[PDB]
Design a protein around this ligand. Structure first.
Ligand SMILES: CCCCCCCCCCCC(=O)O
Ligand SMILES: CCCCCCCCCCCC(=O)O
Ligand SMILES: [Fe+2]
Ligand SMILES: [Fe+2]
Ligand SMILES: [Fe+2]
Ligand SMILES: [Fe+2]
Ligand SMILES: [Mn+2]
Ligand SMILES: [Mn+2]
Lengths: 273, 272
C-alpha cells in the first residue's frame, strides 16, 4: 500500500543527484538502434572467411547475453529503491532500463543483419561466464525482493554496476574498438558500441552513487564492497583467460591489463569516507 | 538463474506485437517535460482568485499521485512477464515505465512552477480515490511477485490499464483539456497533457493485448475481466461524484464521458 505520494505532499527533489542524472539521460539518450545502418557489417561479415568469422562471435556472444541479463536483472533494484521511497532513483532507473533494452536490441539486430541469428552462440559461454551472468548476477539482484538491507544493496550494485558493467563490459567495448575499428570493420556495430558506451557512463555513476551513499552511513560496508569485488575477480579473469585462449586459435596482454586496470579503477571510485 | 538467453540462442521476435509497439514508442516518445515552458502557467495561476485557484488543485492532486503510483506500480508487471520469458513485452515495458516517469515529472514541474509545490494536495484524495490508488492498484500489481497466474495478470492489467489509465486518466485528461483549453489557461500544462495522451495510447494497447491473449486461452477469463471491472466501478464513480461536488463547465457531460470510457474498455475485450 501507498502511504502517500511525494509529488502530492511536496515535489520531486530537483537537486537530487539521481534526478540530475535522469535529466542528463533524457538529454543524451536519444539514439535508436533501429536507425543504425548495418549493410556494410553484412558485407564485411560475408567477405570474412569462416575462420575470420569465428573470431568475432565470442565477444558478441558475451554482449548479447550480458545485455539481456542486464535488462531483466535491474528490475529488482528498481523495485527495492521504489519501496524505500527513493523516487528520483526510480525515475533515473527507467532510463537505465530502457537503455539496456536498446543495448540488447542493437546486438540482436547486428546478429540478424550479418546472418547469424539462427546460430546458437551459447557455446562461447564457459563456466566462469555462466557463474557471473547465469547465476551470480540474477541471484544478487533477486535477493533485493526479500532483503533490501544495505549489505544486499551494496552487493547488487557491486555485481551489476561495478563488475559486470564497470569491469567486464567496459573492457569488451574497449577490446571491440581496439580490434575492429583499426581493421576498419563493422562500422554499424561500432557506432552502436559507441552509443552504448555513452549510456553506460551514466549507469556506472548510479552504481557509484548507490555504493557510496551506503558506505557513507557506515564505513564497515567499504570492506564488504572490496571483498565482494574480489570474490568475483576469479570469474572475471577466468572469462578473460578463456576468451584469450580462443582468439589465440591483437595484444591480449594489453587487453588483460585493461581488465585489471578497470577492476582497480572501480575500486578506487568508492572511498571509505 | 538464467536458463539461457533468447538473443544468444536466436534473436528478438521482430514481428511480435509488443516489439512493434516498442519500436513505435521510441519513434513517438521523445518529448521531454524539461522543455515545456511553464512561465505563463505561473502567471495564469497567480491571476486566479483564491477560489479559482482551489478549483484546479483536486484534479492536479489526482494526476500527480496517479502518475507516481503508475510509475512505481508497473514494475511487478515488468518482472512477471520477464520471468515468463516475454522479452519483447519487457522491452516495450521499458518505454512504458519511462513514459510514466515523464508523466509524474511533468505534473511536479507544473506544481513547482505555479508555486503550489510546498502545498500538500492529499486533502483532495477522498476514500474512493485512496481505495483505488493507495490500495487496490498496488495490491493488484504486487500480487504478481508471487502469483503470475492468468487470473492475477488479467486482474493486474484490468486495474492498471483498463480502470486507472483507460477510464480514470483518459477522462481526467479529457476533463482538464475541456475546462482549461476553453478558459485559455495553463498552456504549458495542456501541452504536456497532449504529449501524455499520446504516450498513453500505446499503454492501453499493451493492456488490451495482455488481457485478450489470456482471455483467448479460456473464455472463463472474459467473465473474470468483466467482474474485475464492475468491482472497481463504485470507486471510479464515487471519486467522480466527489470531484463534481467539490467543483460545484458541464459536469454531466464529463460524468457521462467517464461511463463512456468505462463501457468502451469493456468492449475492447471480446469473449473470443
Ligand atoms: C582478452 C579479452 C579482453 C576483453 C574482456 C572483456 C570480455 C567481456 C565481454 C562482454 C561481456 C558483457 O558485458 O556483456
Ligand atoms: C470531473 C470528472 C472527473 C474525470 C476523472 C478525473 C480523474 C483524474 C485522476 C486521474 C489520475 C490518474 O490515473 O493518473
Ligand atoms: Fe548498463
Ligand atoms: Fe577456470
Ligand atoms: Fe500509462
Ligand atoms: Fe462514497
Ligand atoms: Mn548495457
Ligand atoms: Mn501516465
Amino acid at each position: 500500500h501507498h502511504d502517500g505520494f511525494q509529488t502530492v505532499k511536496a515535489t520531486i527533489d530537483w537537486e537530487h543527484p539521481m534526478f540530475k542524472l535522469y535529466e542528463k539521460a533524457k538529454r543524451n539518450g536519444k539514439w535508436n538502434p533501429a536507425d543504425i545502418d548495418f549493410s556494410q557489417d553484412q558485407k564485411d561479415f560475408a567477405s570474412l572467411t569462416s575462420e575470420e568469422k569465428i573470431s568475432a562471435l565470442p565477444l558478441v556472444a558475451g554482449f548479447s547475453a550480458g545485455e539481456e541479463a542486464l535488462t531483466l536483472d535491474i528490475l529488482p533494484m528498481a523495485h527495492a529503491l521504489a519501496r524505500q521511497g527513493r523516487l528520483e532513483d526510480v525515475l533515473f532507473l527507467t532510463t537505465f532500463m530502457h537503455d539496456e533494452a536498446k543495448h540488447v536490441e542493437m546486438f540482436s539486430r547486428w546478429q540478424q543483419a550479418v546472418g547469424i541469428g539462427q546460430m546458437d552462440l551459447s557455446v562461447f559461454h564457459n563456466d566462469h561466464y555462466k557463474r557471473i551472468f547465469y547465476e551470480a548476477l540474477p541471484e544478487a539482484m533477486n535477493r533485493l525482493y526479500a532483503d533490501d538491507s544495505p549489505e544486499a544493496v551494496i552487493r547488487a550494485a557491486t555485481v551489476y554496476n561495478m563488475i559486470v558493467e564497470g569491469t567486464l563490459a567496459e573492457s569488451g567495448y574497449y577490446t571491440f574498438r581496439q580490434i575492429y575499428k583499426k581493421a576498419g570493420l563493422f562500422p554499424g556495430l561500432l557506432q552502436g558500441i559507441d552509443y552504448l558506451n555513452m549510456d553506460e557512463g551514466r549507469h556506472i555513476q548510479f552504481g557509484i552513487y548507490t555504493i557510496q551513499r551506503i558506505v557513507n552511513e557506515d564505513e564497515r560496508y567499504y570492506e564488504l564492497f572490496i571483498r565482494y569485488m574480489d570474490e568475483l575477480w576469479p570469474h572475471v579473469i577466468g572469462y578473460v583467460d578463456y576468451l584469450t585462449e580462443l582468439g589465440k586459435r591483437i595484444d591480449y596482454d594489453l587487453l588483460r591489463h585493461y581488465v585489471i586496470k578497470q577492476f582497480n579503477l572501480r575500486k578506487k571510485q568508492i572511498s571509505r569516507t
